[PDB]
């Protein structure tokens, strides 16, 4: 009834895995992607798939009920999706350019921390929502890119609240039981950086 | 109660003008933008503002009720928002490069025509929806960019159905009464092309 055409490394595919397990939806994971196929009908683009999952299985909501709060959630999701030019530079740049790219990524994450997260445990408050799911790539995927490139970005000293969020997110049992193996993910990131020089 | 911080040329600001007039919402237009301010609270990004307007004033819906149909509408909106690298080239490129950029824009519009519009009068069926509004920049703004650059993109011969859609959209009384003056818009596009060489 529900098929997920994805991969074992893509953070975009894992956003869908999380949202489906948060709704209790059974699916067959078939390893561009991701493409969710529900009753033979396909939905592409992880952000479009997430809103489809939220509307199709409304129990245990992953977006707030208030329209202003929903607009703020979509604003932060769009903000993360737009700021990908800074993250690409972590796979291409080397030396002094790489340290400038890492500082740019930190400034992007700082806006998210100050204006999006604030003092909440999660972007969704006391539990994860679609905003947390959309920023989940900043946990073990960003950690792997940092190690493969030799640069530090998400540190407790420079981003105290976002660093504490990233630990809390990765420790959520649903997330902990559904993430790539770090060793395999790091080797994948090293290979991607090698390809893009 | 509702303020719109915008401009007289931005197609992104006009998407908001249309959606507000389709809902019968009175507002003060104050001429980055657009920023809708509702009860002192600001919402930025035209696509985030459109979903906020649709949720806040649910009468005369601008999105379908079915989740699969809503996902398809959001997919096409995201598709138009992503394919902006082809449209930028119409302001920068010259000669043989400009004709190659115009053909790339045509291929982007052809996918939209075949898979998004099909045989419907509008992307929303018998009346305009948020998909039509999001593609409204392909009407008089694209016409102005074509004239300022000396290239043809949306022609009846190469895009028969999308060309007929663009005429139908621009003739909708709500749109006809709420678009920039073509002379002023063309002079703005000529100036933007001059700036970007
Ligand atoms: Ca870290
Ligand atoms: Ca034309």
Author numbering:
A (entry chain A), B (entry chain A): 3 to 33, 52 to 217
Provide excerpts from the study.
PtGSTU19 and 20, two paralogs sharing more than 91% sequence identity (95% of sequence similarity), would have diverged from a common ancestor of P. trichocarpa and P. yatungensis species. These enzymes display the distinctive glutathione (GSH)-conjugation and peroxidase activities against model substrates.
In PtGSTU20APO, no signal was found in the electronic density map corresponding to the region between β2 and β3, which includes helix α2 and its upstream and downstream loops (residues Glu34 to Lys51). PtGSTU20 has a valine residue at the beginning of the β2 to β3 region and not a glutamic acid as the other known GSTU crystal structures. Indeed, this latter residue participates in the stabilization of the region between β2 and β3 even in the absence of glutathione (see earlier). When a significant structural change is observed, α2 helix most often undergoes the most prominent rearrangement, as in the case of PtGSTU20. A cysteine residue replaces Tyr160 in PtGSTU20 (Cys160) and only the first conformation is present whatever the form (U20APO/GSH/GSP).
